[PDB]
Design a protein around this ligand. Structure first.
Ligand SMILES: C[C@@H](c1ccc(C(F)(F)F)cc1)n1nc(CC(F)(F)F)c2c(=O)[nH]c(=O)[nH]c21
Ligand SMILES: C[C@@H](c1ccc(C(F)(F)F)cc1)n1nc(CC(F)(F)F)c2c(=O)[nH]c(=O)[nH]c21
Ligand SMILES: [Mg+2]
Ligand SMILES: [Mg+2]
Ligand SMILES: [Zn+2]
Ligand SMILES: [Zn+2]
Lengths: 343, 347
């Protein structure tokens, strides 16, 4: 359960901004797997995506400040199996896919799309590989600061994002008007807080009604709800990839969750069944997660954007794959080597 | 028709700064005492009294606040309250005055940061902005625009009060803190959000055990959570401070509270719903409701305050004394709801 922080540029300045097709001919496709990109190329890909969406030119972002900000955000992640920089990078890449494939500019303002992308980059900053309930249980300084207001980790992720903006030479919004600077902070706060599953559960009925009635671009609340839905669709986007990606991400998720369970046991507390390597049956847990959490989010996305149909179909297909592979997975927890390759 | 409460305008200035800011002793020699009843000050003098309190606490000088901006901000906040019997500007003014009394009598500068005390006072002025004379449950039942915006997160009215405070700061010529650094401006917004949200009784009940733990172990001025808990406790003590005044005040405030609550109950009945017993003029027995409110909500707040600040003992004693007064009333009060003339002057 020990996950380290790497700390407390010239390559990016020389050729950090590349045409996205040079990264991969399939880079702007829903079939691209951003985890296939070497970690050392991810900062360049972030700048390339911001350039391709034209935010660097439109918002007059200083490229050296943007390169420093990207490197700070990357260094802001610890190394647990799942909640690491490669996860934030892949969530950011999905936001870019939504911009490139769906007609986002016809639903949201440019500033809202920009905040969604930056929020994707920052949304799990300084994650400890433990959930909100663990923060409360371990009586952590994060729980001491935020538990009374809800969403302990998410309030921390936003605080970490603000701390990077306040670091000398990293403020990518430095030249914005006081009104636009504040608008960015408010959007980042709302979007990052939307990543707490408890928040999604509380607003589900309202997202359901928005898709039922129809998206109204003149309704400010519809913009807020859509941003919440888009953010959760980016956070769960590993489930929209191929079966091999889904299988590997289950391995990473459960290695992280089971380490939390082991730590709770060492503290003399009984963990939730899903975090207990002695009780959890991964295929059943993943089928339930896909049915209750991921599939409804992508079905809502399909209802608002017809071009998103393939995402829901992929999630449903990955759910069916777990049922078919469960006959070969006869154990609780993970195998001795923590790998699901045998499936 | 008694549920219709108007806004004076939409979401007296030159006159407010003509003779300069008044020293508090010129307003009243008893202005900084726990025996002062701020509801006695004429409503037209309240904006000047707010500036006078900010000047006496040295916030205008220490933060170099622009006096015309502060005068406009004060007038916008005052105009931001509707006219229900209890949740009107005189309540926000009285709550702000109590904050000032805590500053003067409990020497808060030895427990909290200057910016925290400043945010507490501003939050007191703004904490019930645009109140409709209804509770949070009513917003959900009436399917209001406020419930549509905030019901999932709880504290519907309190999130609205904070939003209204922010809208005033965003009005041209009303941003009293726009010269603050980005870090300090954010600190002020976070403090105002937390302090206003602490006025939801459900929030107070959730943090109650932690407030008791803090009072038991002892306040630590180096502990950030202790500062946050203390701000919540002080805000709740300001919000219920009418109970620390004389019996005449407690009796009048019961009249105002129940006129407001019963109008909500009548409105719920007109909507085909059965309201809470405390809001139903046909079921409510005011002396017992007030004894319960005092014993289970108000007295524990002033007891925690006394535990943390010995000089606050007189506040707890006064609240306990007003509770004993309701026990005396319960043996000479034979009606449900309020009398037909809506007056408790028969007491
Ligand atoms: C951290 C958590 C989680 C984060 C965020 C949201 C929200 F944004 F929707 F609220 C929900 C859930 N999470 N993430 C995955 C991986 C992913 F599916 F994303 F590929 C999984 C998973 O496979 N099984 C789980 O029981 N929880 C999982
Ligand atoms: C609006 C409510 C109320 C506000 C705020 C808080 C918290 F901040 F503590 F949470 C609790 C309770 N409230 N206010 C009073 C008047 C006062 F006592 F303040 F003089 C009363 C009352 O006499 N009886 C009640 O049943 N509820 C009352
Ligand atoms: Mg998260
Ligand atoms: Mg209130
Ligand atoms: Zn995430
Ligand atoms: Zn109040």
């Amino acid at each position: 359960s020990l996950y380290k922080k790497a700390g407390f540029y010239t390559k990016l300045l020389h050729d950090g901004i590349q045409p996205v097709a040079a990264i991969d001919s399939n880079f702007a496709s829903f079939t691209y797997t951003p985890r296939s990109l070497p970690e050392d190329d991810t900062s360049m890909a972030i700048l390339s995506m911001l350039q391709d969406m034209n935010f660097i030119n439109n918002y007059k972002i200083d490229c050296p400040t943007l390169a420093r900000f990207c490197l700070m955000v990357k260094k802001g992640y610890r190394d647990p199996p799942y909640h690491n920089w490669m996860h934030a990078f892949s969530v950011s890449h999905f936001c870019y896919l939504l911009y490139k494939n769906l007609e986002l500019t016809n639903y949201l303002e440019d500033i809202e799309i920009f905040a969604l992308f930056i929020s994707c980059m920052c949304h799990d900053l300084d994650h400890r590989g433990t959930n909100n309930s663990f923060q409360v249980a371990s009586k952590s300084v994060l729980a001491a600061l935020y538990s009374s207001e809800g969403s302990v980790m998410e309030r921390h992720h936003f605080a970490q994002a603000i701390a990077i903006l306040n670091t000398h030479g990293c403020n990518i919004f430095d030249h914005f008007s006081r009104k636009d600077y504040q608008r960015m902070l408010d959007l980042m706060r709302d979007i990052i807080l939307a990543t707490d599953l408890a928040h999604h559960l509380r607003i589900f009925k309202d997202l359901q009604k928005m898709a039922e009635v129809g998206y109204d671009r003149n309704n400010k609340q519809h913009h807020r709800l859509l941003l919440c839905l888009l953010m959760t669709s980016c956070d769960l986007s590993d489930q929209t990839k191929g079966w091999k990606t889904t299988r590997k991400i289950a391995e990473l998720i459960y290695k992280e969750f089971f380490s939390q369970g082991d730590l709770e046991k060492a503290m003399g507390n009984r963990p939730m069944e899903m975090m207990d390597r002695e009780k959890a049956y991964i295929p059943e847990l993943q089928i339930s997660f896909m049915e209750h959490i991921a599939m409804p989010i992508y079905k809502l996305l399909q209802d608002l954007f017809p071009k998103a149909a393939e995402l829901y179909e992929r999630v449903a297909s990955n759910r069916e794959h777990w049922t078919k592979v469960s006959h070969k997975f006869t154990i609780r927890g993970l195998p001795s080597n923590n790998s699901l390759d045998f499936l």
